[PDB]
Symmetry: C3
Subunit: 410 residues, 3 copies
Amino acid sequence: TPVWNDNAHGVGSVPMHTDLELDFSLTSSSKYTYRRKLTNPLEEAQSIDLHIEIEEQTIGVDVHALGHWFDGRLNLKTSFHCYGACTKYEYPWHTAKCHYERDYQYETSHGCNPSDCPGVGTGCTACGLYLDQLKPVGSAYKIITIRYSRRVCVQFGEENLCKIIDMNDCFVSRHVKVCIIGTVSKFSQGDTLLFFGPLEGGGLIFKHWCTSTCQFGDPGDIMSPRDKGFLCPEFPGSFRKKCNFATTPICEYDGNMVSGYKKVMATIDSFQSFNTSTMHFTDERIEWKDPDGMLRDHINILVTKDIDFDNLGENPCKIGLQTSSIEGAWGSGVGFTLTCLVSLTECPTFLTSIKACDKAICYGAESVTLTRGQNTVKVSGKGGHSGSTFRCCHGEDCSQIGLHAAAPHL
Amino acid sequence: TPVWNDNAHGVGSVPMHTDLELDFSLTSSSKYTYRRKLTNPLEEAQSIDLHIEIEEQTIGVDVHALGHWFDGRLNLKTSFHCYGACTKYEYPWHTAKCHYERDYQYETSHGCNPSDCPGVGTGCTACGLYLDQLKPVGSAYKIITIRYSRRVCVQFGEENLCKIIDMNDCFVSRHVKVCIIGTVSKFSQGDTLLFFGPLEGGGLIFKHWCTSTCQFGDPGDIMSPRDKGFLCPEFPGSFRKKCNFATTPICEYDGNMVSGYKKVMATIDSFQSFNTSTMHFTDERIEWKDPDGMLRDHINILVTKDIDFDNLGENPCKIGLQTSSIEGAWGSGVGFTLTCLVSLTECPTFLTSIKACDKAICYGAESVTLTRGQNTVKVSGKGGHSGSTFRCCHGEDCSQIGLHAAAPHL
Amino acid sequence: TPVWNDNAHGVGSVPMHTDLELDFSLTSSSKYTYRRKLTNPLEEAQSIDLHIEIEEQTIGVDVHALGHWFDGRLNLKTSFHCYGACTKYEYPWHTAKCHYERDYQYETSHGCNPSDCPGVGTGCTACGLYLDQLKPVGSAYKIITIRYSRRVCVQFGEENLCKIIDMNDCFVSRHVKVCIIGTVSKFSQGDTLLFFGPLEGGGLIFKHWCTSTCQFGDPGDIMSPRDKGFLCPEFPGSFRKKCNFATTPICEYDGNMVSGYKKVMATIDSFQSFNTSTMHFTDERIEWKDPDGMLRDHINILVTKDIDFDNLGENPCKIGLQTSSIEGAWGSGVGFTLTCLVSLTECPTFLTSIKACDKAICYGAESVTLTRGQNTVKVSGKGGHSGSTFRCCHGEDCSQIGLHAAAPHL
Ligand SMILES: *[C@@H]1O[C@H](CO[C@H]2O[C@@H](C)[C@@H](O)[C@@H](O)[C@@H]2O)[C@@H](O[C@@H]2O[C@H](CO)[C@@H](O)[C@H](O)[C@H]2NC(C)=O)[C@H](O)[C@H]1NC(C)=O
Ligand SMILES: *[C@@H]1O[C@H](CO[C@H]2O[C@@H](C)[C@@H](O)[C@@H](O)[C@@H]2O)[C@@H](O[C@@H]2O[C@H](CO)[C@@H](O)[C@H](O)[C@H]2NC(C)=O)[C@H](O)[C@H]1NC(C)=O
Ligand SMILES: *[C@@H]1O[C@H](CO[C@H]2O[C@@H](C)[C@@H](O)[C@@H](O)[C@@H]2O)[C@@H](O[C@@H]2O[C@H](CO)[C@@H](O)[C@H](O)[C@H]2NC(C)=O)[C@H](O)[C@H]1NC(C)=O
Ligand code: NA
């Protein structure tokens, strides 16, 4: 007969037994303070201090750091030999991290040879494209998850409690409820954020950063994921061997010659900037306060001075947690799955959520009806980094250890 | 003087004449149950059973099924003839559903002919690209419309009513109001959902699935919309005829050789997965429950035990409906328009909404001020399938027949 | 000790001292009217007229007008001369606004010359691509900012006040609060809106309109930003010179030949339409009412008849404003920054917002704690046009002049 459930975060109240309601639209980038002495209508001389502090909205973005985007110049060179396979000779572009070679092997002919080459169907004209004058222009981050929150502190008499409240969640206590409701549409999963400097200050949003095909000229075309090593772009144009009598062959390439950075800069007003304040970069995560004062969220504060609220998630159920296994990846839009062993006592069943968390950041949650005794719960999550130890959590309680997920893009 | 309006779904209340309020943030993937005996303060011995059941959030997506995405291999063949027009000969790739031929016609020459061909300016070198080793890898669906809802059942005494409540709509009865407020940003119109298996389980979101230009290597490059017949990708590279004395010409192609499926798999962590539970595929529609427990919505429940709420949409107006005509398409982001003949009586005017619906799914709505007598109302909608009969509807009332829209992509 | 803050738009109330609450979900495209006489419970004969009018939701989009998109035909011509540099001769495509020339200079040869040309390594074969049969097919607009609002008028007794209330903001007066809460996901920043006619009526949303690389065949490939002058697309295919003995060379081009307009039309159902009503185009801004009756927002109205609400933003602080400087651009996703000189009196500090506005449209806001005396406040904004004079504003108060930002895409 009982069907305990703690997935409802909020309260039951009787409107005539409720003393105060604050309801307002608050600038997202603003804090809010409320202080009041709750006095007894005047049948008493007993007063309760109420002190509420709401902090500015914070955004937390789980990301994959993509490394640096580069500007560069596309260069073309020709190397001709009258005799010998193309691989017999070393070419100047061989040291270039990003090069692309097209060979014309065993194709010498009378009207396309230098004066000293009498070869026909011999040797090699090698054409080499390579990037040079490389310079990093910014750091790029792929958005995996976006969350907004406000830190909320409530003092009611001598009770004082602070909590980070996610947007569209509620702060719940015996005498005070604080609910935050809102929506923001600035950032999307899969967007790529580009920071051109120590871009505290701000950055750019790219909605079409190249992924499965990067061609030279694309946003994101030339990337270095870590200090050394490039992900090189494709060069989709064609080579031609230009021929003349008594003349060395000359390679031509008819594709785009202008880097993605230059093409983006040339139409920079087509792209959306954002600003940041009090940035915090950690591995695969960025947190900041967006100073855009045009954005607002909705705050509702309900206070009952005498009778307690009915906490809609109240229950006698008791949970023990440990991690069992993990699969999947950090830094990945596909994500990981954490398997948890969860013990339920003091209730035949309990509808609740089990979360994958590390250091008070949560990366995933599974709603589940647990049965008395042991339960196996799989939690899907996204985000984290190589050093993350994802723990199985229930409310503020977590297991004693956590597990690492695998690296993405292997 | 009267200006009846039923577009407001909700209630007028007097806070001192209201007995109970539940206000909370609920895990989207969780149900919620509230049961209570409403007793008379103690001036009576009369109690009313209140029983509220809120079901897990469901997503309903109107889609266009795009068929299967394929992996495959790009092959190149050459066919040379010393004499004759290129069309005089049948080539091996002619049976390939996806092939592309480039001809060098009447271009034979001394330094590019096999030993037995003395032709000059004759015959044909035919170059043929074709896809083979084709294998379907997943089913793709273009998102047309996204809607979220929760089924809400309220028993108040012997009154019992269940309704599917859309997110950002309200359940309204004489004694109980249930409002659901929320926002989700996981899916967008125009996204393409890819299911790799019986992907109950989950799938991938693609934000850049090819549409007006599909090149080989793109996400979505090789599609079969129905069982037989391909939408073939473009091959944007160039052919070359490689020549040698006393040698048959050899075709070369310098474009990308790697399928879109392989390119996407090679950077799969760049893409966003989603999970599903209790999937229901119907023609051009998918419904499921998203098990992502990180998502929440806001629930407000208001109860008055004695005096009825003031139903803000209450009115004496009476409506008769029939379909008149339709234009436009199902399975289309452009959509259809249903024309309805709507008769108003018992009111000089009535501000309301007329909807296009089939089997309790609604695909479009028009807010309108009707005048006494006959009215012509055009309703824009999107979604449905070839078997849909779109009816003109008002509230829960619909016309006696419905109409079919036309097929998309003709 | 005081910490005045006017960034909270709303009220403090005591639920037992509140007389009326209206709470409902309203069709976005519908107006709403409430009229009532608030009578004194019956201890009096004094009645207060309450009259609330809520207008249909309006969308306001700050845009950059991109000019007209064109359909056209891609044509190819050859021009051969036996002798002379390619630049020595004028070619037919030279007058074409969008043309692309590939030259084969000093490459004549025996098996590729007309009968009257004995040249070897001389002259020129010039290949010219050009667009012709150009026709504008629609007007395109890049979305910079999206905002929704409703005009709200409240009469309470002889007090009458009308205000445009942004979605997720509140109307605040002594006796009536009106809060609007909602979310819409139809349009996104960076989307491109295409109107094919006087498209009052509607248009199409493009999520991938070309920007930093436009190739022929892309959505947005051929644009004319203003009356005269094209932004021409790239032609990424290859030229070939087809050769025969005693024959003039013939240029070939192997790239896509089909315009972006034709490719988009051929799969038009892949794209999302929207409808409009009562459109208003101004420079770099479009406003309309979306007639999509499937969309709803949430309205809460709270009334206290006797005791005033506690206005949570009430304060004694006084502000003087003037513009100081500006940098950045109108019509730009990167935006501008307006620097304001702001004088605070009657308070040691004041937490508030300073806005950049022109003619009652606001383009940006900065939340700031001002100190008594002079303050310098930088406000980031987006939108506007060449004729905008951005003023520094606080609430409904603005400075005496405003400043122009610079043009984008210089
Ligand atoms: C939630 O989804 C994950 C994701 O796995 C799926 O990814 C989709 C995008 C699609 O490609 C699909 O074919 C694929 O299965 C599920 O986890 C996976 O489960 C399979 C089957 O056991 C394993 O082989 C995978 O290694 C595993 N991956 C991860 C990262 O865990 C998961 O089962 C599903 N359901 C739940 C409850 O989480
Ligand atoms: C709502 O919009 C539809 C859509 O029609 C428009 O589609 C735009 C994307 C754009 O291309 C525009 O040029 C086009 O008109 C309107 O319906 C269309 O109306 C025209 C004019 O009568 C007809 O020729 C079309 O067949 C018709 N199409 C459909 C699907 O009905 C519609 O009029 C408009 N208004 C309302 C109230 O629905
Ligand atoms: C808010 O952001 C603007 C934007 O400027 C930045 O744009 C980013 C996309 C990125 O490219 C970054 O490197 C760049 O600085 C800031 O304004 C700019 O500030 C610099 C430094 O003084 C000036 O050189 C620019 O001209 C100026 N541009 C504009 C349009 O004002 C701004 O400082 C930042 N902070 C605030 C409080 O607005
Ligand atoms: Na080419």
